[PDB]
Amino acid sequence: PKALIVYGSTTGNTEYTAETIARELADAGYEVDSRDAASVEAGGLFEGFDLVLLGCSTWGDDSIELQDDFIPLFDSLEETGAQGRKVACFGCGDSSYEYFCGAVDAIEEKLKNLGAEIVQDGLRIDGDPRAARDDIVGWAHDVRGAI
Amino acid sequence: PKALIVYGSTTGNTEYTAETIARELADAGYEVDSRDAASVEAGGLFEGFDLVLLGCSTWGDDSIELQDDFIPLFDSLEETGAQGRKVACFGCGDSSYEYFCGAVDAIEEKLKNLGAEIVQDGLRIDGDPRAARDDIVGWAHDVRGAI
Numbered sequence: 081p082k083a084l085i086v087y088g089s090t091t092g093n094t095e096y097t098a099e100t101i102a103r104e105l106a107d108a109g110y111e112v113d114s115r116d117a118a119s120v121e122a123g124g125l126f127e128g129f130d131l132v133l134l135g136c137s138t139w140g141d142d143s144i145e146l147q148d149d150f151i152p153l154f155d156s157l158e159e160t161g162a163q164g165r166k167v168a169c170f171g172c173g174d175s176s177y178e179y180f181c182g183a184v185d186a187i188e189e190k191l192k193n194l195g196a197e198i199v200q201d202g203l204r205i206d207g208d209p210r211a212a213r214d215d216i217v218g219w220a221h222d223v224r225g226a227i
Numbered sequence: 228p229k230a231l232i233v234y235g236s237t238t239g240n241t242e243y244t245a246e247t248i249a250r251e252l253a254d255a256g257y258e259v260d261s262r263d264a265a266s267v268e269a270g271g272l273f274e275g276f277d278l279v280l281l282g283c284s285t286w287g288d289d290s291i292e293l294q295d296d297f298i299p300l301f302d303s304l305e306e307t308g309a310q311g312r313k314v315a316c317f318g319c320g321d322s323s324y325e326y327f328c329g330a331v332d333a334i335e336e337k338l339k340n341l342g343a344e345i346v347q348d349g350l351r352i353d354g355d356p357r358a359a360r361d362d363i364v365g366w367a368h369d370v371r372g373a374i
């Protein structure tokens with residue numbers, strides 16, 4: 081099948097995460113398209129894809145603010161072709177903050193409001209994702225078995 | 228009890244195996260509903276059934292491919308009501324191929340991932356099922372004790 085991976089990454093963590101999940105789907109036969117959210121246009125972005133995975137980090141001094149490159153996509157989520165789409169979300173964060181991986185919850189909530197089909201609960205990585213490689217590959221294997 | 232048998236059969240071998248099982252269960256007092264996958268709709272197919280038996284043959288030039296009539300169902304297995312359902316698989320194939328009854332493995336795996344309860348290891352027949360009538364009968368007897 082074809083999978084789209086769109087990520088907003090500032091420090092390289094979410095990018096590394098996206099890339100580890102990309103390699104696992106490609107190994108299972110998927111044709112994978114991995115894109116930085118800074119370079120995509122929301123209008124019809126998901127058309128033609130069997131599975132869409134969205135990843136983003138959480139920022140903000142008081143509230144949950146999504147990663148800067150992802151904000152425009154989030155704000156135009158209704159024009160992407162999400163209704164009825166198989167999607168799953170991922171993000172890196174730090175459990176010391178009150179809303180750990182709060183960007184995953186905000187994206188999952190909006191996607192459910194748009195009628196997307198959430199295939200698996202969001203992968204939330206605390207600290208260095210390189211330390212959690214195993215959880216990352218494990219979650220990729222689970223989203224694949226479900227669809 | 229009520230059992231549903233859904234099979235994808237091209238040459239008649241998976242069909243004959245489905246029919247032999249159906250008679251064994253009917254003989255043990257079950258109400259059996261046997262259907263060709265070509266005539267079924269996936270939405271809620273398993274509702275109201277105590278036991279669901281899925282049979283499929285394996286094709287494909289180099290990859291393992293499901294029998295054509297079963298493909299649509301397999302692709303929509305998440306809408307059948309498999310979660311918590313007691314199921315078991317069966318299929319005909321040929322040991323000269325690299326993935327002997329590979330469709331049986333693919334279907335068990337997906338059911339597992341959907342939270343179905345696999346009640347007995349799948350029945351894999353090499354060659355003419357007419358020649359393995361005893362294994363068929365013995366397996367149908369074994370699924371009866373497990374439910």
Ligand SMILES: Cc1cc2nc3c(=O)[nH]c(=O)nc-3n(C[C@H](O)[C@H](O)[C@H](O)CO)c2cc1C
Nearest residue numbers: 091137138139140172173174177179180181182
């Ligand atoms: C100002 C600021 C706010 C952050 N807010 C959060 C947060 O709300 N939840 C979270 O999981 N991580 C938060 N982080 C961690 C951030 O997503 C990132 O994971 C690390 O700073 C880079 O590894 C924050 C970091 C900064 C600098």
Ligand SMILES: Cc1cc2nc3c(=O)[nH]c(=O)nc-3n(C[C@H](O)[C@H](O)[C@H](O)CO)c2cc1C
Nearest residue numbers: 240284285286287319320321324326327328329
């Ligand atoms: C082109 C082709 C591919 C087949 N692939 C398989 C396979 O991968 N595994 C298997 O057990 N049988 C395979 N079979 C046998 C097939 O499922 C079938 O059992 C017999 O032709 C009748 O059941 C194949 C048959 C054909 C013609």
